[PDB]
Design a protein around this ligand. Structure first.
Ligand code: 3PE
Ligand code: SF4
Ligand code: SF4
Ligand code: SF4
Lengths: 296, 70, 168, 90, 176, 139, 156, 212
């Protein structure tokens, strides 16, 4: 039965990614001005299934490095929905947010290995700069994560989903949460913040995207947990994660890519004092409001 | 409008709904109707361990309550 | 599928250290060292094991080999000696495994009781606060001097790095 | 063995998907370097900082407050030193 | 008269600088751009289904390169070579024998659809309005053999419709 | 509230509604202008915007073809091709024909890459007419 | 002949999969590039078909030559064409590209892209109508409906 | 692809030393082909040397020939020529803005204004019939005048397009990030703008007042 838990965890995320591709193409069309895909298949679902099939059919380093980059990217994509408390998480990790950070770092490894095995100097310097702007935001992500769980005591994240029954945690740290959400945009490598098997590489990218969406929805807000009926909590949680993913599309389809030096200059000299000042305020302040959270 | 985008969004919303609901279904199914315990600390592990010891069936969910009194 | 999983993971650990001690191309070396750090983290997370290896998993395998691969890719870019030393190191591994298994004790200059050992281990004692996590939850009450000199050496490392890489 | 089995299933399904994906056909910049070492040092100071909420329940609150502000203040001072000394220009 | 742009500075009034700083620190006009593109999300999309609704045209569109003929009559071309004389890409090849019954005619009247730039100079120049651009644009030819028209291809192409070109010439005997 | 439920019955039944939407694309039925040879139907709405006034709906098996799927351009007769591009605002039921005896009534459609498509050849008789050597052999 | 029936339906499946997506790369030199980016406009979506513009030549499906191919261009053209995956299909758009056309009689014009790459679908026009280019993509998709690759591999 | 050009840049990294824009890739022999053809038969060469200015190049060639040939064209020809000149100017500026956007990133304003550009192509369809290369401006006044039922449609377009360009400035134009992308770069000294042969929008931007 535990193997059935495993398969229901790691198989339907692939269907989730494929239907995310159709949703982002459709909604970005309706943003832009486009019906479509609506011709191949009823309302475009056979179209992404055929996308994945056709990309599997085609007939395209150091086969060590050439295979060890996408195998690591996609095993990260599989392993990284382990402790997310869709009410009962699959493994009750006593500390999981540090696991989130560590596997972001492993994704950095995957991109660097594929860039090394690309073996062409323009792609090499491009992958190098992409590694630097992937690594340049795991500072801010870590420190904001630190300050938002300092309000809630423990790394366990189940205590977090307890503590967000009273208020949505977007209120008692809104600018901190906003800066974390911009750093999720940076870590997902999408607009504004910017060879094979592209199916695997693409797949790992979008699974990391939906991971950050779900982790945003769990880390900051949620619904009241019904005793002995978690279906309603799962419904409202999933709808909030989907509305944030549509909001993520909504930010995608409207802004140009930054210049790379503007990106770094913006990160250091604009996030990094402001994150530090907000984080020291969340250090010094719960000791001033007679409120330190109970690590159990 | 959105009149042709809610099919894909609805199907993908079911496809994201399914692992949590199936996991809760299996957590209730694989405990005799109870909830799985969560021992973060060694104290709750010892408490759970003596619980599965005194059930006799090597299965703690039975919990043999107020029946081995006298 | 058996008891001695600590000894098994330690064999994979020694395999990894040999696999980059044979001096390969340095990105093969980085791959082997990532595998070594992962199974060392698995070992310490198997000795309970709550926090500290996973803590350093961010740092040693999240903040070090990235910088090594970075500075290897922007510096520079099969042979019988490397493969020969790897096979002989594997052979010394095989011989030490054999002398652990089909003997009683192994001595390099010690005595090692040759059997897989969960011993010694805690006797299920009531912690309730996850001892090593509260150990790391020191340094901030009793740790006056230590974090002072540590942060001070961090600041001096900063100014040293930039000066050597052409301050200003 | 739960999470070891899950990890192994992730690895095996990923290798299955890679083998299906494979078998069916069948000079530099100095500014690059300072980003890495700047990350390395600030990530080390992260590694010092982040077990703070485990610690946040002591009886010597004033000492914890003072050394915590010492740590973040030194992090911001190292940032301020490279900021004044044009440490990340382009 | 010159009405030039950006001769103005952000004035140093305290409300001006705190509104610009709120624009900076709170991303406000960015969110205004978000609201703009959502206002175009909720519109009705301006697409057309192609294979069931073909796009609009004019009566004066330039198409197909057909030869016409008289009302139940002979070939309206005479082989007077004007269409080669003004064809800029020179895709028109004309060779003109007179036929058996004394009247002057052709042998060979060829267009290269590869070469034709579709101006209708031959349309403006044919003195009897024989060669006329058609309405439709559907060739999509798999071969480079087929895109060299001959006289019987052009006459069958003129056989494939007249009532279209009848309505077009009835719409364009007045302007052209 | 109303349009998404009075449309299947407004199409005639769930046989056709499955047919019309799974066919290719669209469900904007209802105006019933005409139909013409090789079965095809022609509708003109007066409710939506320009370019979505008019549409053909093709039929199957019109030249030994089984064209339920993969509909072509120019399966259409030419008078509806005048109608459909909005070269006129008037249907071709006013005066379609002409009394000329050379127009196809068959409309041999797009045919490239079939057993039947056009090939080029020089439509000219003999060029130089060589001297034929004689019949009776000397010596 | 259950094997042959499986071969028929499986060939149907992979031919449907090949014709379904077809994301191209736009080569696009002159004003026919403007016409391609006008048949990606709202009034003619390639994205109704799943046909998505993409500048990645390592995953391109159909190469659309469009514009005035020159001698100075042509080695770069076939260097692009070589590092394209073996399922490749070629649309020659425009009278410049399907036979030289208006700049036929000059130096530095290859007389159509037949001399460089093999061509599947010629579509004429100077410029072609966007609507006509979409029709040309439809007739290419009917060619992809007519492949019988798996039948030929079954009885080769 | 990032037009189509050879760029040969030489740089210290994330930076520059000097570059060479190599062009000649799209060379077609237009001047030679006009040297063998006549005036009317080569007016399309001027129509498609530049392809965006599908009427302004026509107007320039026709005024070259009319200036050489002593012909003052009639007034309604002049007004129709000026109307189409301003329309093609509108289309050329809107392409410049939108391909600047699609170069920079910035997906959606490209498609808004290409809906607009499809409508103006439809007006060229009704006037000449050609999609883009409406040659149509014969030397000696414009042949084949505009048909009945057009000017009020241009009037309707004018109202709706003034709204759509207000909405385009709402989208772009004092955005934080587009300003952040391109303000600092591309300064041109107006004295050097005169001497380096910069003409048109460059003289608009750098200082000195000029308009033909
Ligand atoms: C290759 C191995 C890859 C391991 C990835 C990291 C796993 C991880 O982060 O495990 C943390 C977790 C700690 O246990 P936790 O639930 O936090 O409760 C504390 C007391 N168990 O660890 C566990 O729950 C189990 C520790 C690892 C056991 C399997 C080791 C396999 C090697
Ligand atoms: S101009 Fe007309 S009549 Fe003269 S040769 Fe050409 S098609 Fe024939
Ligand atoms: S339309 Fe132009 S290129 Fe074509 S045949 Fe006529 S004159 Fe020649
Ligand atoms: S065929 Fe005509 S429209 Fe196309 S690139 Fe050539 S000149 Fe331009």
């Amino acid at each position: 039965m535990f193997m059935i838990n495993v398969l229901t965890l790691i198989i339907p995320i692939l269907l989730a990614v494929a239907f995310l591709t159709l949703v982002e193409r459709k909604v970005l069309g309706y943003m832009q001005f486009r019906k479509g895909p609506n011709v191949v298949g009823p309302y475009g679902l056979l179209q992404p299934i055929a996308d994945a099939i056709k990309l599997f059919i085609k007939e395209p380093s150091s086969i060590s490095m050439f295979i060890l980059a996408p195998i690591l990217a996609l095993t990260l994509a599989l392993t990284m929905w382990i402790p997310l408390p869709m009410p009962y998480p699959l493994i009750n990790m006593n500390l999981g947010v540090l696991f989130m950070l560590a596997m972001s770092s492993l994704a950095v490894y995957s991109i660097l290995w594929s860039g090394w095995a690309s073996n062409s100097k323009y792609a090499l310097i491009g992958a190098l700069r992409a590694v630097a702007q992937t690594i340049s935001y795991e500072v801010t992500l870590a420190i904001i994560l630190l300050s938002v769980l300092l309000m809630n005591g423990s790394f366990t994240l189940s205590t977090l989903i307890i503590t967000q029954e009273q208020v949505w945690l977007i209120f008692p740290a809104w600018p901190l949460a906003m800066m974390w959400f911009i750093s999720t945009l940076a870590e997902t490598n999408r607009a504004p913040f910017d060879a094979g098997p592209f199916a695997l590489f693409f797949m790992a990218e979008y699974a990391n995207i939906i991971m950050m969406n779900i982790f945003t929805t769990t880390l900051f807000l949620g619904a009241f947990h019904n005793p002995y009926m978690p279906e309603l909590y799962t419904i409202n949680f999933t709808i909030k994660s989907l509305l944030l993913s549509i909001t993520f599309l909504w930010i995608r389809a409207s802004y140009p890519r930054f210049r790379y030096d503007q990106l770094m200059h913006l990160l250091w000299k604009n996030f990094l004092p402001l994150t530090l000042a907000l984080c020291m305020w969340h250090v010094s302040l719960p000791i001033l409001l007679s409120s330190i959270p109970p690590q159990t | 409008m959105w009149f042709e985008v809610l099919p894909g969004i609805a199907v993908m919303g079911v496809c994201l709904f399914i692992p949590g609901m199936a996991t809760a279904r299996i957590h209730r199914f694989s405990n005799g109707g109870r909830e799985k315990r969560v021992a973060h600390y060694s104290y709750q592990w010892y408490l759970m361990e003596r619980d599965r010891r005194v059930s006799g069936v090597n299965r703690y969910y039975v919990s043999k309550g107020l029946e081995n009194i006298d | 599928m058996m008891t001695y999983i600590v000894f098994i993971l330690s064999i994979i650990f020694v395999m990894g250290f040999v696999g980059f001690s044979s001096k390969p191309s340095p990105i093969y070396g980085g791959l082997g060292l990532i595998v070594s750090g992962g199974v060392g983290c698995g070992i310490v997370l198997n000795f309970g094991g709550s926090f500290l290896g996973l803590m350093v998993f961010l740092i040693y395998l999240g903040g070090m080999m990235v910088v090594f691969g970075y500075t290897t890719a922007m510096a520079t870019e099969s042979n019988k000696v490397v493969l020969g030393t790897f096979i002989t190191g594997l052979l010394m591994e095989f011989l030490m495994v054999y002398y652990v298994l089909k003997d009683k004790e192994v001595e390099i200059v010690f005595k090692f009781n040759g059997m897989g050992d969960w011993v010694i281990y805690d006797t299920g004692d009531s912690g309730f606060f996850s001892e090593e996590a509260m150990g790391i939850a020191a340094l901030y009450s009793y740790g006056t001097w230590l974090v002072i000199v540590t942060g001070w050496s961090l600041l001096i490392g900063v100014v040293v790095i930039m000066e050597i890489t052409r301050g200003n | 063995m739960n999470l070891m089995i899950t990890l192994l299933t992730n690895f095996t399904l990923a290798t299955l998907l890679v083998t299906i994906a494979f078998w069916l056909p069948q000079p530099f910049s100095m500014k690059f370097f300072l980003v890495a070492i700047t990350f390395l040092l600030f990530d080390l100071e992260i590694a010092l900082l982040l077990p703070l909420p485990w610690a946040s329940q002591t009886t010597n609150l004033n000492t914890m407050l003072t050394m915590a502000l010492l740590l973040i203040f030194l992090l911001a001072v190292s940032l301020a030193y490279e900021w004044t000394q044009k440490g990340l220009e382009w | 008269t010159y009405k030039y742009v950006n001769l103005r500075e952000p004035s140093m009034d305290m409300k001006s600088v705190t509104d610009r700083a709120a624009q900076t620190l709170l991303w406000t006009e960015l969110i205004r751009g978000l609201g703009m593109t959502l206002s175009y999300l909720f519109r009705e999309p301006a697409t057309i289904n192609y294979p069931f609704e073909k796009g609009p045209l004019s009566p004066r569109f330039r198409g197909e390169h057909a030869l016409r003929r008289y009302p139940s009559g002979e070939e309206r071309c005479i082989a007077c070579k004007l269409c080669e004389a003004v064809c800029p890409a020179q895709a028109i090849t004309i060779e003109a024998e007179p036929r058996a019954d004394g009247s002057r005619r052709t042998t060979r009247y060829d267009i290269d659809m590869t070469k034709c730039i579709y101006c209708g100079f031959c349309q403006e120049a044919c003195p009897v309005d024989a060669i006329v651009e058609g309405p439709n644009f559907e060739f999509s030819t798999e071969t480079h053999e087929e895109l060299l028209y001959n006289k019987e291809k052009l006459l069958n192409n003129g056989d494939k419709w007249e009532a279209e070109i009848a309505a077009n010439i009835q719409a364009d005997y007045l302007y052209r | 509230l109303k349009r998404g439920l009075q449309q299947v019955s407004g199409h005639g039944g769930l046989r056709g509604y499955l047919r019309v939407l799974f066919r290719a694309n669209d469900v904007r039925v209802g105006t019933l202008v005409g139909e013409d040879k090789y079965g095809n139907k022609y509708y003109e709405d007066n409710k939506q915007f320009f370019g979505r006034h008019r549409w053909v709906i093709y039929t199957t098996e019109m030249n030994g073809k089984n064209t339920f799927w993969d509909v072509d351009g120019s399966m259409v007769p030419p008078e509806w091709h005048r109608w459909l591009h909005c070269m006129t605002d008037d249907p071709p039921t006013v005066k379609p024909p002409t009394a000329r005896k050379f127009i196809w009534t068959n409309h041999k459609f797009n045919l490239s890459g079939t057993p039947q498509q056009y090939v080029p050849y020089s439509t000219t008789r003999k060029k130089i007419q060589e001297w034929v050597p004689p019949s009776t052999p000397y010596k | 002949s259950r094997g042959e029936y499986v071969v028929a339906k499986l060939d149907d499946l992979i031919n449907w999969a090949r014709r379904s997506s077809l994301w191209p790369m736009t080569f696009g030199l002159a004003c026919c590039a403007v016409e391609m980016m006008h048949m990606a406009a709202p009034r003619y979506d390639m994205d109704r078909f799943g046909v998505v513009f993409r500048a990645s030549p390592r995953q391109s499906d159909v190469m659309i030559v469009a514009g005035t191919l020159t001698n100075k261009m042509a080695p770069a053209l076939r260097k692009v064409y070589d590092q394209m995956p073996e399922p490749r299909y070629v649309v020659s758009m425009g009278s410049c590209a399907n036979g030289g056309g208006y700049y036929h009689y000059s130096y530095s014009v290859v007389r159509g892209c037949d001399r460089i790459v093999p061509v599947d679908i010629y579509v004429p026009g100077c410029p072609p109508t966007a609507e006509a280019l979409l029709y040309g993509i439809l007739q290419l998709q009917k060619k992809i409906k007519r492949e019988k690759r798996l039948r030929i591999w079954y009885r080769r | 692809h990032p037009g189509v050009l050879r760029l040969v840049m030489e740089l210290s990294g994330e930076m520059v030393r000097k570059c060479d824009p190599h062009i000649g890739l799209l060379h077609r022999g237009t001047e030679k082909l006009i040297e063998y053809k006549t005036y009317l038969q080569a007016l399309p060469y001027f129509d498609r040397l530049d392809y965006v200015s599908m009427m302004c190049n026509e107007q320039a060639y026709s005024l070259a020939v009319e200036k050489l040939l002593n012909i003052q064209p009639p007034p309604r020809a002049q007004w129709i020529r000026v109307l189409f000149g301003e329309i093609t100017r509108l289309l050329n500026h809107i392409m410049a803005v939108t391909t600047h956007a699609l170069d920079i990133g910035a997906m959606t304003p490209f498609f808004w204004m290409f809906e607009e550009r499809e409508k103006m192509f439809e007006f060229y369809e009704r006037v000449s019939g050609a999609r883009m290369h409406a040659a149509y401006v014969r030397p000696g006044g414009v042949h084949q005048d505009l048909p009945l039922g057009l000017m009020d449609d241009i009037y309707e377009f004018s109202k709706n397009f003034s709204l759509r360009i207000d909405e385009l400035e709402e989208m772009l134009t004092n955005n934080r990030i587009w300003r952040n992308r391109t303000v600092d770069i591309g300064v041109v000294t107006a004295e050097d703008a005169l001497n380096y042969g910069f003409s048109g929008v460059m003289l608009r931007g750098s200082g000195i007042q000029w308009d033909l």
